[PDB]
Structure formats: structure tokens, C-alpha cells
From a paper:
In Gram-negative bacteria, Fe3+-siderophore complexes are recognised at the bacterial cell surface by highly selective outer-membrane TonB-dependent transporters (TBDTs). These transporters bind the Fe3+-siderophore complex and translocate it into the periplasm. The structures of pyoverdine, pyochelin, citrate and ferrichrome iron complexes bound to their respective transporters FpvA, FptA, FecA and FhuA showed that the ferric-siderophore complexes were bound inside the barrel adjacent to the plug domain, a position thought to be poised for translocation. Pseudomonas aeruginosa, a serious opportunistic pathogen, does not make enterobactin but does possess a TBTD outer-membrane protein [name], related to FepA, that binds and translocates Fe3+-enterobactin into the periplasm. [name] has the same two domains (22-stranded β-barrel and N-terminal plug) common to the TBDTs.
We constructed four mutants R480A, [name], G324V and R480A-[name] (double mutant) to validate the observed recognition site. Each of the mutant proteins was purified as described for the parent protein, and crystal structures of each were obtained. These structures were essentially identical to that of the parent protein, which confirmed that the mutations did not affect the folding of the protein. Co-complexes with Fe3+-enterobactin were obtained by soaking for the R480A and [name] mutants. Apart from the mutation itself and an additional water molecule in R480A, the mutant complexes were essentially identical except that the B-factors of the Fe3+-enterobactin molecules were higher reflecting a bigger mobility or a partial occupancy of the ligand. Mutant [name] showed biphasic isotherms, but with much reduced heat output and smaller K1 values. Two single-site mutations (R480A, [name]) of interacting residues revealed weakened (but detectable) binding in ITC experiments, behaviour predicted from the structural model and consistent with a genuine-binding site. We further note that in order to form this binding site, the protein undergoes the same conformational changes for all three compounds and in [name] and R480A mutants.
Residue numbers in the entry: 24 to 721
């Protein structure tokens, strides 16, 4: 099965029958437990949604490629409301070179450590064979409404042997998703008056991709393998008017249709793999270098996250991320039969950002200990980590898996993340699973940095109208979460029925603070002597929900599958507001008809439940009017198919959103001056869209 309790596999076959436009989030999000959301509740950058596991936010979803971390979004400014203007990190590997995807949710993910408090998504690539193989994949879609951006995608792969002990695989992808038209939300925008009249919330950003990966596998002995791989990728956007607050100016408009951010991502990795008598061994060194070049934005008030016209032009933020990992695996023959794993891990994150730390203090007054001009660009953190797993067979069919992970973060201090995972055959058809772990979150380098400084004259300040600063805070604690799950699954002859309950108790969630810690001195007029807030740890928050699956084989050629997410709770227990905005439930339904040996056909439905916006504004006050708007439940249906022409050639074709259900971003969630709020209506849902596809492979 592709769904056990806590875990989902997506195969290459699934990727082909629900072909993604471009980013994998599209298909990853259809698993149980998984949503596609922003990180907090502002609605800012709300068309830039990313994979969210059990409502824990997408910063707590750790993305791996072939077991190796992706850190690139940590190169984008982390803003006052916990969003980055980033597309996330699931669009680095092209869909057609993926062998499979693993999604691991809650207690089974905490053993991976930093940033897995929601879970892990591990994107696995196809590997070289016994003979030389390769493929050519093309995809092209066609929206009904021309406003919306079409997508085109071309990718190859090519792999095989060279000597008897030498293998290679390479692939390369070129793709484009056109942006939505700059005006796509016209007539649907929130009410905009005075200076802000005419402003627009934006449609989906476009992107251009170039990815090129090369790998050599060398197995210098029967027991010993050595891999070298390098990746070069580049995403450049197509800008369509998006700004943090939905305000506009002339620089914004000048840039409509142009590249305004480009991310270059380079990865190099050496991996040694060892298999002998006492068991298995594995170690790797990865260097990820991310360059994030974008137009300078402002860092104050309504000017936070809009192109700054006084400082026109590009800056480049640089992320050097360094990862090395070691492990061994020992079968142990003892009074209980078992498997032991011992490992270290070391990472370094260097961040150079010459832009984010440049807000100055001439208006709100200055801040003792913080220079107003030429603050450092630099941040870094190292975590060292040790861990051990034991995989214990109590009695055949029953497994107990304890592990301990310890992490030393060189600023925040020591973390202890223990875990315990149980599975139990109760019957030959029924299996009970339980897991309880404490997962780990390192503050990001923006939260942590006393030189990172934002400003507002009042509207964004919690509990007051005066000017205020927000400041990074090196005193911060790590976020930890006690992720519980209890689940039960019937499985027999492709009949599958399972239901899991999960609760994550969430401690020290980091977030812009509520009380001033101090006041600056000096500055101009009514803004002088502004209040100073920091990034704080929220003492307690909770998420809670249900994951279900049901799979029935209607007849031989024909399979009916369903995945269910239901979100019971999502609560900042300090403020009482919600953490993320999710749909109350999500049901995904596929019917799969294997009509002939050669022709497969697929119908799908997704039902999304209601969605509620935040209740409180940036002041902490209760919102009014269109800031309260909710999104009603809706469903999206789709048909597609794949017709095999030969061993060497298949064709695909279908329609996403059969019934043309469309939604439109009206703005951000709350009122500001001149720009009424849009509540939960913060994203654009695309309409009917035809697509075709073609895959040739030897
Ligand atoms: O969405 C927000 N703005 C909107 C809506 O607010 C406004 O348009 C006005 N605004 C206030 O009167 C205000 C009254 C009382 C208190 C204020 O802070 C006001 O701004 C004017 O400000 C501006 O025109 C611009 N703005 C600055 O230059 C600025 C420069 C330095 C410092 C600033 O604070 C600035 O606004 C752009 O502002 C906007 O478009 C918004 C969000 C989050 C936090 C904010 O502070 C926002 O203002
Ligand atoms: Fe302001």
C-alpha cells in the first residue's frame, strides 16, 4: 500500500497519472495530513503556498533530495508575519526524473531533527540500471481563461554503466510557468480607497527553471561504494504585482513581466556506502550554495516587502549550507531480535544578506547596542548531533523503535529529542500503530539576529498605535513539539481502511512579540522614542486532527482510493488565534480504471472544507467587515488518462478542474488604511485547464 499510519509513498507511476504543472507540491499535498498553505496567518505572499504537514507550517516541513537536505529558502528574508517571498523548495527536482516521494509525518519524522516538527518530504531520483536506459518527457497545459498562466516542461534522463564497477546518471530539465496576468484579480479585490485606490492583489508568480544534475557511482570493492554528484539549478520569476501589503508604486508596475528575483542553487555531494559482515554503513558531505538575487525592498511599515524606489537595483543574498552525516547499522542477535543504528551529524549555515539589516533608526530613535548604519550582513549557526535507533522485534509482526537524538546548537544550546514508535499486528488484517516523540526546531537566522530590524509607525505594532521596532533575538529558545499519533489500519487484498488521530503539543513557537521589551531614544516628531519588540517564544500552541484512508477494489480493472485530512484544532494558546489557515478537511478521491493492458483512465475529486481567517489584527484587536470573510467548501474534479503506444512511448492527456471552480486573491487577511482585508480569500485557484504529455524511454 502507499499509505501506512504516519507515512505516504508517492510512486513514479502516480506522478504520471496526476501530472503536475511544474512544482511537486501539487501532488504531494494530496496525501493525508498535508496541506498547501502559508506559514502564519497574515495572508501575505498568499499565492506562494508551500507544503504543510499537520498544520505545523512549511518551515517545519523538511525537504530532502535522496536523503540530503535542501536549505535554499533560508536565503529569503523572513518577514514580520513569518512569511518569506519564496516559492519553497519542492520545485528543484523535475517531476519526470523522480522515482518516488516519501512523506513522513509526526513522531516518525522527529528522529531527523531540525525542522521536521511537521514532517519530512524526501524526493527520490531515478537511478542507473544494469544496462543503459534514458527518457524524454514533455508536458504542456492550456488554461480555459488566458489570464491564468500556462506551463511547459521538457526533461531528459540518461543513465547506465561505464566500467564494470562504474555507473552514472544525468538529467536536465527546462520549464516555464507563465505568470497570471497583472490584472487577473480585478473586480475581485478588497475595497481600496484614497491613496490605495487602484491597487491590486496579484495572481500567481511565474517561474523559469533550468536544472542539470550529474552523478557518478563507483564501487571500488564488493562491499564499498562511492558516489559523486553535483546539481546546478536556476529559477527566475516572472513578476505580476505581488507585494507584501498589496500596495503599489511605480517601480512595481515597471517590473510587470520581468525577472525580479533569481535563485541559483548549486549542490555538490560525496557519498560513501558500505555493506559487510557486521552490517551497513553510510556517510555524506553536501555543500549547498544558494544565491538569491532580487530587487531591494523596504523594511518599514507598509513599505515592508515592496520594491524600494530610492535604492533601485538588485542585491544578492548568499547561503552556504554544509552538511555531513555518518551512520552504521548493526543486526543484533539477543534475547530480543533487533537492528541498531548509530550516527553523528554536522551542519553549518552561513547567510550573507546585504539588504535585510539596513533599516535605520533615524525616525523611531536609536537603540542602545545597535548601530544605525553598516551593521553586519552575516549570520551563521552550527548544529552538532548524535543519535541512535533501535529497531526491536518483540514478537513477529510487532516492532518497537526507540531512539535518542541530541543536538548542540552553538547559540541556542543543547536539545534532547527522544522518540518511540510502536506497531502491532492485532490480527493478520489489522495493525495498530502508536508514536510519541519530541521534535526540534532551530530558530532561523533572521529571528536570531539582533541586527535584523524592522519598523512601523504604529499599524503593525501589537497593543498600541505608536511607532515600534521589531528586533532579532539571540536569546531565543528552540521550538520543540511533542508529536503524538495513535492509528489503526485494516489491510487485506488491496482493501485498505485506516484512521489516525494526531496531536502535536507545540512549545516556544517563535513569532513577533506582544510586549515592548524597551524603548528607543530620539528620532522625529510623534514617532520618536519608539517601542522595541523582539522575536519571542510563544509558550504553548496545539494542533490536532485526523488522517484517514479508504481503498476498495471495485473489480479487477478498477480501484477506488480516498485520502482524508480533518483539522480539529490549530491554536496559539497565548493569543487564541489560529497558527496557519487550513481547510477544515480535505478529501481526495481517485477512481483508477485500467481499461486495457495499454489504456489507463483516471477520475479525481478533491473536496476542501471551509477556511477561516485570523480573528485579530496586528494590534491584537478584533477585525471587522471583509476581514472576517470565510471561504466556503468547494470541490475540484479532474479526468485524465495515459495511452501506451509501445514499450518506448506513452501519451497522456486530461482536464484539471472540470467544473471551472475558480477563486481569486482579494488581498491579505486584515484591514489596513486604504486597503480593506480579504479574510480567507488570499490565493488564486486556477480554472479549467487541459493538458497533454508524452514520455519516451528506452
Ligand atoms: O499595509 C500597511 N500600510 C499600507 C496602508 O497604510 C497607508 O497607506 C498609510 N499609513 C498610515 O497612515 C499609518 C497610520 C498609523 C500607523 C502606521 O504605521 C501607518 O502607516 C500611509 O503610509 C503609506 O502610504 C506607505 N507607508 C510608508 O511609507 C511607511 C514608511 C515607514 C513606516 C511606516 O509604518 C509606513 O507605513 C504604504 O502604506 C500602505 O500601503 C502596513 C502594514 C503593516 C504595518 C504598517 O505600519 C503599515 O502601514
Ligand atoms: Fe505603517
Amino acid at each position: 500500500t502507499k499509505q501506512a499510519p504516519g507515512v505516504s509513498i508517492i510512486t513514479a507511476e502516480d506522478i504520471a497519472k496526476r501530472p503536475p504543472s511544474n512544482d511537486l507540491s501539487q501532488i504531494i499535498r494530496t496525501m493525508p495530513g498535508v496541506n498547501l498553505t502559508g506559514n502564519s496567518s497574515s495572508g501575505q505572499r498568499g499565492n506562494n503556498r508551500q507544503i504543510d504537514i499537520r498544520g505545523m507550517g512549511p518551515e517545519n516541513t523538511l525537504i530532502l533530495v535522496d536523503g540530503k537536505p535542501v536549505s535554499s529558502r533560508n536565503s529569503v528574508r523572513y518577514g514580520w508575519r513569518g512569511e518569506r517571498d519564496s516559492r519553497g523548495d519542492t520545485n528543484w527536482v523535475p517531476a519526470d526524473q523522480v522515482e518516488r516521494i516519501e512523506v513522513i509525518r509526526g513522531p516518525a519524522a522527529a528522529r531527523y531533527g531540525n525542522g521536521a516538527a511537521g514532517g519530512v518530504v524526501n524526493i527520490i531520483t531515478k537511478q542507473a540500471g544494469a544496462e543503459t536506459h534514458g527518457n524524454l518527457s514533455v508536458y504542456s497545459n492550456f488554461p480555459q481563461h488566458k489570464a491564468e498562466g500556462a506551463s511547459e516542461r521538457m526533461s531528459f534522463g540518461l543513465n547506465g554503466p561505464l566500467t564494470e564497477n562504474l555507473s552514472y546518471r544525468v538529467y536536465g530539465n527546462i520549464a516555464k510557468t507563465d505568470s497570471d496576468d497583472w490584472d487577473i484579480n480585478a473586480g475581485h479585490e478588497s475595497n481600496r480607497t484614497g491613496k490605495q485606490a487602484g491597487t491590486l492583489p496579484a495572481g500567481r508568480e511565474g517561474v523559469r527553471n533550468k536544472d542539470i544534475d550529474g552523478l557518478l557511482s563507483w564501487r571500488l570493492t564488493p562491499e564499498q561504494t562511492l558516489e559523486f554528484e553535483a546539481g546546478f539549478s536556476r529559477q527566475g520569476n516572472i513578476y505580476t504585482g505581488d507585494t507584501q501589503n498589496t500596495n503599489s508604486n511605480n517601480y512595481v508596475k515597471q517590473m510587470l513581466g520581468h525577472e525580479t528575483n533569481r535563485m541559483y542553487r548549486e549542490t555538490y555531494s560525496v557519498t560513501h556506502r558500505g555493506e559487510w559482515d557486521f552490517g551497513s554503513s553510510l556517510a555524506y558531505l553536501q555543500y549547498e550554495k544558494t544565491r538569491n538575487s532580487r530587487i531591494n525592498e523596504g523594511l518599514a511599515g507598509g513599505t515592508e516587502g515592496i520594491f524600494d524606489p530610492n535604492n533601485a537595483g538588485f542585491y544578492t543574498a548568499t547561503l552556504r549550507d554544509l552538511t555531513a552525516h555518518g551512520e552504521v547499522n548493526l543486526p543484533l542477535h539477543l534475547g530480543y531480535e533487533q537492528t541498531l543504528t548509530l550516527g553523528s551529524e554536522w551542519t553549518e549555515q552561513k547567510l550573507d544578506d546585504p539588504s535585510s539589516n539596513t533599516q535605520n533608526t533615524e525616525e523611531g530613535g536609536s537603540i542602545p547596542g545597535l548601530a544605525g548604519k553598516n551593521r553586519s550582513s552575516s549570520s551563521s549557526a552550527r548544529i552538532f548531533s548524535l543519535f541512535a535507533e533501535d529497531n526491536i522485534e518483540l514478537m513477529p509482526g510487532t516492532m518497537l523503535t526507540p531512539g535518542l537524538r541530541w543536538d548542540h546548537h552553538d547559540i541556542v544550546g543543547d536539545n534532547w529529542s527522544p522518540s518511540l514508535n510502536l506497531s502491532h499486528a492485532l490480527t493478520e488484517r489489522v495493525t495498530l500503530k502508536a508514536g510519541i516523540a519530541r521534535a526540534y526546531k532551530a530558530p532561523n537566522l533572521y529571528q536570531l539576529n539582533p541586527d535584523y530590524l524592522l519598523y512601523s509607525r504604529g499599524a503593525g505594532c501589537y497593543g498600541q498605535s505608536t511607532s515600534c521596532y521589531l528586533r532579532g533575538n539571540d536569546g531565543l529558545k528552540a521550538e520543540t513539539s511533542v508529536n503524538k499519533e495513535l492509528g489503526i489500519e485494516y489491510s487485506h487484498d488491496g482493501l485498505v481502511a485506516g484512521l489516525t488521530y494526531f496531536r502535536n503539543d507545540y512549545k516556544n513557537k517563535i513569532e513577533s512579540g506582544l510586549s515592548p521589551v524597551d524603548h528607543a531614544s530620539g528620532g522625529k516628531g510623534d514617532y520618536a522614542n519608539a517601542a522595541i519588540y523582539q522575536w519571542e517564544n510563544v509558550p504553548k500552541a496545539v494542533v490536532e486532527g485526523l488522517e484517514g484512508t479508504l481503498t476498495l477494489p471495485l473489480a479487477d480493472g478498477l480501484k477506488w482510493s480516498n485520502n482524508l485530512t480533518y483539522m480539529l484544532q490549530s491554536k496559539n494558546k497565548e493569543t487564541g488565534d489560529v497558527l496557519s489557515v487550513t481547510p477544515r478537511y480535505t478529501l481526495n478521491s481517485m477512481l483508477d480504471w485500467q481499461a486495457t493492458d495499454d489504456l489507463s483512465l483516471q477520475a479525481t475529486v478533491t473536496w476542501y472544507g471551509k477556511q477561516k481567517p485570523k480573528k485579530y489584527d496586528y494590534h491584537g484587536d478584533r477585525v471587522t467587515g471583509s476581514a472576517n470573510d470565510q471561504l466556503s467548501p468547494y470541490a475540484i474534479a479532474g479526468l485524465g488518462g495515459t495511452y501506451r503506444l509501445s514499450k518506448n512511448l506513452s501519451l497522456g492527456a486530461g482536464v484539471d478542474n472540470l467544473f471551472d471552480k475558480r477563486l481569486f486573491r482579494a488581498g491579505n487577511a486584515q484591514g489596513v488604511v486604504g486597503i480593506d482585508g480579504a479574510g480567507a480569500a488570499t490565493y488564486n485557484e486556477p480554472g479549467r485547464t487541459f493538458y497533454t504529455s508524452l514520455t519516451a524511454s528506452f
